[PDB]
């Protein structure tokens, strides 16, 4: 009845987990056929941006949800099964699944001319039924639409292997003894490159913008952990840049020594990649890395560096793009293309609407996604009130210009906030 939460991962189990404590009306309706988000796929085979080799790379202590601890026999990074179990257990102690419709896909959003707004839902027949909601908390993710490189370098239709994102990616022994590329240096290139080194008879890592490889550990601390770290919060920018890029050379080296690009900026400048296991796989030759793919020759691929590969297949690490197809008009966006939500959260002309989880962060996502949950459901019920629009459109302004200038025009960078600052305003 008053709350309808699109999505029951780990946003939409906070929303639903927040709104329950208000005593706040609400389905939560979700097209899997379990809770969990994307970290019950890799264990059903189901495509997914996960894949078999998952762990996290933040503390669980950090990553779980603080009212509800990770069990104790579980590891600092649990695997994705580990993850999946853990959230499945969260939703039956918070009383959750009896508001939960499973196998039911949101397909159409509509803001009614009253103020409700109507949900046409696909059932598991794929029965359309359409009901009406005061309010809709969107927590359907950010990693649902494959990003694929434009161009395709040339000769991708002569190809005789197949070429793939890693949104097909499922696990490393589906390649045994063959030749795979993979292309990226994000945290899913590096996991699927370690993973192939052991699988593949050969696998190359082609990198055409040099990333930051930090390791998921420095001084035996995750560096999530490190981040709140009191002695490591009170350095100041370059102050801790200086010592953080210190730890690494003395831990790592820098990237100019394992044939990887080193990258145009300095560490938190766009993105980092967190490894334990790539630089080492290199320099057992479990990987070999390549610049950027020039061209596929039929059956190998040509770097831009003249050199040639035989090659049986390539996945594409390029990450996902930020869609929200039941939503007709889009989410709230500048003609840049930015993302327009005060506080990342509320679009500023769309009473009843909150977008949660929408945000990337310094480390863990979980308790920003519980900050979030527990203002929205305040705004639901009237304990908590936004600003007139034109004052919540100056925030967003303010956020944006400060984006540009920090993160710079980059994709993605209109979710982005540090941990601190803005878990300082709830
Ligand atoms: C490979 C990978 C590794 C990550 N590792 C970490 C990590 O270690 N630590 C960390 O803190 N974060 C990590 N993240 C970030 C991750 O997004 C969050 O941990 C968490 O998954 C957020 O879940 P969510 O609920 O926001 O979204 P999702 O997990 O995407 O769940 C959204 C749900 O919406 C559902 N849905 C229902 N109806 C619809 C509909 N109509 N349309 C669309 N969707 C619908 C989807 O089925 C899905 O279950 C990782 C992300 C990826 C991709
Ligand atoms: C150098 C340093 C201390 C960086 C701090 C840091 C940065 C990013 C992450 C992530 C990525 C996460 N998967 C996300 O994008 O939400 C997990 N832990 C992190 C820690």
């Given at each position: 009845?008053?709350?309808?939460v699109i999505?029951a991962?780990?946003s939409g ?7 329950k404590?208000?005593?706040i ?9 379990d809770v969990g988000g994307?970290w019950r796929?890799?264990?059903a085979?189901?495509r997914?941006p ?6 996290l790379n933040?503390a669980k ?6 009212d509800?601890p990770m069990?104790?026999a579980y590891p600092?990074?649990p ?12 939703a039956?102690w918070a009383?959750?699944?009896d508001?939960?419709?499973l196998?039911?896909?949101?397909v159409?959003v509509?803001?009614?001319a009253?103020?409700?707004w109507?949900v046409?839902?696909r ?9 009406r909601?005061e ?7 950010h990693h649902?639409?494959?990003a694929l490189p434009?161009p395709?370098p040339?000769?991708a239709?002569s190809?005789?292997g197949?070429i ?12 045994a ?8 240096l994000?945290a ?5 490159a370690?993973?192939?080194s052991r699988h593949?008879?050969?696998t190359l ?6 990333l930051?490889?930090?390791?998921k550990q420095?001084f035996?601390?995750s560096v999530?952990?490190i981040?709140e770290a ?7 920018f370059?102050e801790?840049?200086?010592?953080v890029?210190?730890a690494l ?7 100019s020594?394992?044939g990887?690009?080193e990258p145009?900026h300095?560490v938190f400048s766009?993105?980092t990649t967190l490894?334990?296991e790539?630089?080492?796989?290199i320099?057992?030759g479990?990987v070999?890395?390549?610049?950027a793919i020039?061209s596929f ?6 770097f831009?560096?003249?050199?040639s590969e035989?090659?049986?297949?390539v ?5 996902f793009?930020?869609?929200?197809p039941?939503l007709?008009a889009?989410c ?5 293309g930015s993302?327009e939500?005060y ?6 002309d769309?009473?009843?609407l909150?977008f ?7 480390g863990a ?8 949950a527990?203002w ?21 302004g303010?956020?944006l210009?400060?984006?540009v ?10 979710i982005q906030?540090?941990?601190?600052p803005?878990?300082?305003e709830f």
């Amino acid at each position: 009845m008053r709350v309808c939460v699109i999505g029951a991962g780990l946003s939409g189990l906070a929303v639903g987990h927040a709104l329950k404590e208000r005593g706040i009306s609400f389905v939560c309706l979700e097209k899997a056929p379990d809770v969990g988000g994307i970290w019950r796929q890799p264990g059903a085979g189901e495509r997914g941006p996960g894949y078999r080799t998952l762990h996290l790379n933040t503390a669980k202590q950090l990553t779980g949800y603080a009212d509800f601890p990770m069990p104790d026999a579980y590891p600092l990074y649990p695997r994705h099964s580990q993850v999946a179990a853990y959230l499945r257990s969260f939703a039956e102690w918070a009383g959750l699944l009896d508001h939960v419709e499973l196998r039911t896909e949101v397909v159409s959003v509509r803001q009614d001319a009253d103020g409700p707004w109507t949900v046409v839902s696909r059932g598991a027949d794929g029965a359309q039924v359409s009901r009406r909601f005061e309010q809709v908390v969107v927590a359907s993710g950010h990693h649902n639409e494959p990003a694929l490189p434009d161009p395709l370098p040339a000769g991708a239709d002569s190809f005789a292997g197949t070429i793939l994102h890693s949104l097909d990616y499922r696990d490393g022994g589906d390649f045994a003894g063959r030749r795979v590329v993979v292309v990226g240096l994000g945290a899913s290139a590096v996991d699927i490159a370690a993973d192939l080194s052991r699988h593949a008879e050969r696998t190359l890592l082609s990198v055409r913008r040099g990333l930051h490889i930090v390791p998921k550990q420095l001084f035996g601390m995750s560096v999530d952990e490190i981040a709140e770290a009191p002695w490591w919060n009170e350095m100041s920018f370059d102050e801790r840049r200086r010592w953080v890029e210190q730890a690494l050379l003395v831990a790592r080296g820098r990237l100019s020594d394992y044939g990887l690009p080193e990258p145009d900026h300095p560490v938190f400048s766009s993105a980092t990649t967190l490894s334990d296991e790539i630089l080492s796989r290199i320099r057992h030759g479990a990987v070999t890395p390549k610049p950027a793919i020039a061209s596929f020759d039929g059956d190998r691929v040509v770097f831009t560096d003249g050199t040639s590969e035989p090659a049986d297949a390539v996945v594409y690490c390029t990450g996902f793009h930020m869609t929200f197809p039941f939503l007709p008009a889009g989410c709230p966006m500048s003609a840049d293309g930015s993302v327009e939500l005060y506080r990342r959260v509320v679009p500023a002309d769309r009473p009843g609407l909150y977008f949660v989880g929408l945000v990337r962060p310094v480390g863990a996502i979980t308790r920003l996604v519980e900050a979030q949950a527990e203002w929205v459901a305040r705004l639901v019920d009237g304990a908590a009130v936004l600003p007139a629009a034109d004052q919540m459109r100056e925030e967003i302004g303010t956020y944006l210009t400060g984006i540009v200038q920090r993160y710079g025009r980059t994709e993605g960078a209109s979710i982005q906030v540090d941990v601190g600052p803005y878990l300082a305003e709830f």
